[PDB]
Amino acid sequence: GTSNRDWWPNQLDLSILHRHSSLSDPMGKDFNYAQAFEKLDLAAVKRDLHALMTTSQDWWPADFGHYGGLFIRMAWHSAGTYRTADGRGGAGEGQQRFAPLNSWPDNANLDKARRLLWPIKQKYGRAISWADLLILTGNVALESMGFKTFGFAGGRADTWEPEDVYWGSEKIWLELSGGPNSRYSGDRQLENPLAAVQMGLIYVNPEGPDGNPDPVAAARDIRDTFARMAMNDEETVALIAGGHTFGKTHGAGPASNVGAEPEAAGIEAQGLGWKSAYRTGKGADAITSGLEVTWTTTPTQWSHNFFENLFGYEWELTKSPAGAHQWVAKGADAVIPDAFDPSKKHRPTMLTTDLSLRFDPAYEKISRRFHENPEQFADAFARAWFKLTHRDMGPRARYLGPEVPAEVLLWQDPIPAVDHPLIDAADAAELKAKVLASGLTVSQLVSTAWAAASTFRGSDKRGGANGARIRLAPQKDWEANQPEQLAAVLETLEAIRTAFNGAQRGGKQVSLADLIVLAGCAGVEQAAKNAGHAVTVPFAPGRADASQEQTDVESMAVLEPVADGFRNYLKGKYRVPAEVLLVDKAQLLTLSAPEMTVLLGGLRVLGANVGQSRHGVFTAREQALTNDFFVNLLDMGTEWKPTAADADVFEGRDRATGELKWTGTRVDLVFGSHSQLRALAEVYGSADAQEKFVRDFVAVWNKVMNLDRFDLA
Amino acid sequence: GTSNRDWWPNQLDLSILHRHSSLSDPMGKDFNYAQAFEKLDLAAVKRDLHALMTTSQDWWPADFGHYGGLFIRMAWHSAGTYRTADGRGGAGEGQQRFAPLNSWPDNANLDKARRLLWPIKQKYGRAISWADLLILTGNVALESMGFKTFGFAGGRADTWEPEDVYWGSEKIWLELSGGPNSRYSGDRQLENPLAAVQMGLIYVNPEGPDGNPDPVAAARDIRDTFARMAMNDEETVALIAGGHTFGKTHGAGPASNVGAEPEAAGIEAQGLGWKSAYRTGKGADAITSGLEVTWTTTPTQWSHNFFENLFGYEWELTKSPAGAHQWVAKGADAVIPDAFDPSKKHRPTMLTTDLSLRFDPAYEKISRRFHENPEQFADAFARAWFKLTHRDMGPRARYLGPEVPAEVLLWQDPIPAVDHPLIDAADAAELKAKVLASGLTVSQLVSTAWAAASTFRGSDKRGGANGARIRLAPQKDWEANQPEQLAAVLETLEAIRTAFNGAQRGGKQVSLADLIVLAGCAGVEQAAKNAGHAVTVPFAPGRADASQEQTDVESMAVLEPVADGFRNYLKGKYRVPAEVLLVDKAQLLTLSAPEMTVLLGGLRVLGANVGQSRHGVFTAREQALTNDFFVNLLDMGTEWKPTAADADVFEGRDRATGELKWTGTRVDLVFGSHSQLRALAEVYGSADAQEKFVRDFVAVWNKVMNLDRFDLA
Ligand code: HEM
């Protein structure tokens, strides 16, 4: 059946802004997962998971009689899709059970692991999400095998359809680098926002780069991809050595034995995939990755035998039964148990990527230190496993249940607790008037509050106006934030704050985070007043001001809005058209297409553009909240042409006279070109729409202001 | 960006069930189009449309100084996508302004017609939908040119994204028959549900079949496509001759001059397309279809000149300036005006498809009669234009405004008005108890009410339980409805009805249509009671019984559910897999994926399957309303395999012993296979979900019982 995507494959795709609607959700509109989780008997779920670890099912017999290894890998791949660049991927939505992740080659036989969990998911129902359960099961695996975890937070609500993520452009699973859709260019530079070396892998190729079994080269890919998943060298070594203390790989016969991945398998497979014709197709005969490595002499118990083996032997390049490159310990005795036959034993083996931990010079120091101090290894692995499995959950306010660790970690972008009375509605009105009386403009007020609140991304729930991080490095120096203007606005607001706070009793005070948002609300109010409307913009206090020492500058860097269509901003030239980057930012902001549309049209006429650019400012009453963007954009009396100097800027001229009326970017003009966006523009550009436009703009403004307010959830 | 659709292009697409969500809608949740339309000053809109007809814009100058032809074609293409097979297409949702239809080749330069209407749409705003406006404009064009229309109804609400319609499988616009994705096989057999001869055409090729200019062969395509749009010979002849009384075609130079269609054009084109490098690109130089035909001596006035020209000359094959086949009158004088130059005149011309009206024997007789009796032509065209433009609007209760014709027409599937007091809640309770005391089973009651209500399709709003059409030909004879069993149930219900109606006073009576639905409700109550739940099923009286004479047997044929997954029914073997046909039926029923899921699971255990087939009846307490379907389907203790005898039936065996536990179809097993459906099945198959299942089932049951109840809108 030929589709619009087939006819016009480069047209902008708005369906990404309309996923996760109430139509696709089987739970009531009123369902609150946090409330269901809060009543879960978490102890009883853990006792069940513990029993399951050693209760082998004959359809997928447990290696060594213990599923622990399998379930650790399951949870690490659930979490391991995360990219710091956009915050997409990770464990937080349980997307491993949907396409395409459920069928990535790196996720082979994780369908079996998930199916093993059905009885427990069925028993506890809506009270534990598949997303929380994947992670919990990993924790319980570790605990069952003698490793004490750092803690666990529930709260990851289930989703009900595939997330829209750019995972790369390749058309062939696992394609080696350098093809027509290469994710690499230059000196092995991985394109943002990717965080894996090949389509369908979690991070790196366990044989080595593009299959070349060079541990030193593999180390470079490990470091690059893990950094792109927000992990540093110490965390990376801890995670890899920690994980590969347990279990085994599977490659007992040729890969050509393995049938279709789950999304391609026949209906009778009932959601399972990779059915194998090799011998029994399971257990002793299992084929998953193609590698056949078992790392320790006790694969079902925590130990320090991974680093003892790594450093205590020299290693030889060999091949698994499926032909994969892997390494075996030279001259070793048969000390590694067999997963099914008590009478056989094997020499220690390793992946190329495991050898990277010894042969990269910077990893070798860390590995040596962990080998000498197994307690340091254990502590680092515990902390890294928590970060890995929680890095996409957002603020600590979202963390549920009795196992939440009390320690506040830098990567959580922590916000201090509020310890004073909050401002009330009269206070808010007084503050808005003082803000407006200072001389700050509508344009300044809206721009500042937009800049502060629009760092939020729903992908990992990082960013937003909470914390007043706009006043700190690095946000205060981002070009999009206009650092000099920003500093002068912040200084005026801080004088207002000081004056207000010094007049109070009873310890009532207002944070700068709250005042930034409130001041933006006053700007929008005044803009509405300038257009003849009396409205109150809602405002909820309770944000707090975070310190520079609570703000990791390097991890903040990924929030810099190098494209922000809502401010008509592009930091450089990108191979993705600007309208696609608009819709990308809108999705991160959790906006629908109507919300995106109203919001952009308003922000243009309020003066929010970076550098005071006139592009898209289609009004003669700047700083009044009107629908002039849409009415002027849609006027057929104007003809548009790309400029000679820059094909991405357009001149709008009177058709009759040739007089220059406006200029606009691709971001501006897409609203009068794309057939779905133009239909939305037409609603807000009709003669009956000025009141609707004001009310919808206020609503969407308030939504943006509150994106990170999980304290009010 | 590689997508799930790229990796698994044959996987079932559920996003069609979650289209048109509140996310993509710019209007409030509470927006009611009918109430906005009821306040429109329709007379004022029509005055404005009159003024527009001769207000030529320089960017697309009006032929003969009047746009009426162009706007009649616009309206007739809006309506002309309609297929009686599925009810999809037509004018009723305004889809001509969205992809793909805004860019079909047959819709070339209709982007100009639509843009000419923007100022009016803008002036009246939400009070007139684009959908209503396109049709009203057609009407105004006719009336402006001297033709009295039969009427007009408003009420077509605008939609906000593209409708999911199978338009064919070809990958090339306008592909001639016999390609790798041919919509034709056999003796020129068009595949259902298609109603056009080439991808991107409204009905037929104006040059003749696959471009071959044989008017007799063209006539066969005309009859077949128009029948597939619910029009007979008399209506077809009237419409074609009626339309081609006005205006002209456009083919002033080679088609190679014409640029990208709208969805392909550059952003500066602002939603327009087909920009032409031929001379001025417009007006006298316009290129649309490539044909250059002007049919009458007064193209901007109603006349009888079409049939006078058709019959008064003999015709010679020639070519337009773009090289298209067309016809010119032998020996004729230059009598046809030029659209721009008062000093030129042209010989009469015709399309191949116009000549069909003379050279096909059956059309010839009709055309002669219209020629001889012009008042009959006028009246038949007025009626057929009304049908064309309202055929997809549904019941008369949806028709809004002061121009709605009082005459009731057969194709509106009319329902008599209620002229007595309705039953109340006490009466309902009495009737339900009587239904249960008669001996009729859960299975019979649910199957009957399902059969009656599930004829509804939202595409054209035909079908549903209103009218008690299930007791009439042809529904009472459909194999899916089980004629024998149906007759025995209807006879029992009719005795109950007679007894109840005979006891009443004051003219109160219950229709059979109501009693069928009420009896279904009682069956669901009983089924719930069998499972140990106390449930009252909502019911709304007010349906009436239609007569056989109000029920066109031929037009009812298209509602026959040749695939109905909700009863595990397939009438024959089809090239489309049965799970695709399930989701298709759900979409017609307006169901989301969670609704479809709960509904099917319930219907299986209540005994709704055609022929009492055991396929999918995964319970040992048939006729009790439980979630057994889901709990047993998801049981990993069962292994499924296709049977040797039939690859579309599956056996589910105990994995440990090999004992057969169940059988199922592809419709049954898709819920355990498709990753998104199985996530839904899991919610209803959980230990906490028996009450949720029962309540969600009742809600969806009631929804289906009320689909056609536009009398209570
Ligand atoms: C350079 C990074 C990594 C690479 C290339 C890698 C590669 C692999 C491969 C290829 C397998 C075999 C799959 C099979 O055939 O069954 C596997 C197994 C495993 N990995 Fe990793 N791994 C990496 C990091 C991690 C991390 C970070 C963890 C967890 C903290 C982890 C935990 C495990 C576990 C537990 C298994 C055993 C599965 C079982 O017993 O069934 N790995 N790894």
Ligand code: HEM
């Ligand atoms: C077999 C059926 C039909 C064929 C193949 C057909 C074909 C066409 C073609 C090829 C054009 C020229 C498009 C262009 O170059 O501008 C056209 C024009 C038009 N058709 Fe049809 N037509 C059909 C039926 C209809 C019907 C049912 C109506 C309306 C009741 C209609 C009304 C018109 C009008 C008014 C125009 C003139 C447009 C103008 O002046 O710009 N036609 N037709």
Ligand code: NA
């Ligand atoms: Na994420």
Ligand code: NA
């Ligand atoms: Na339709």
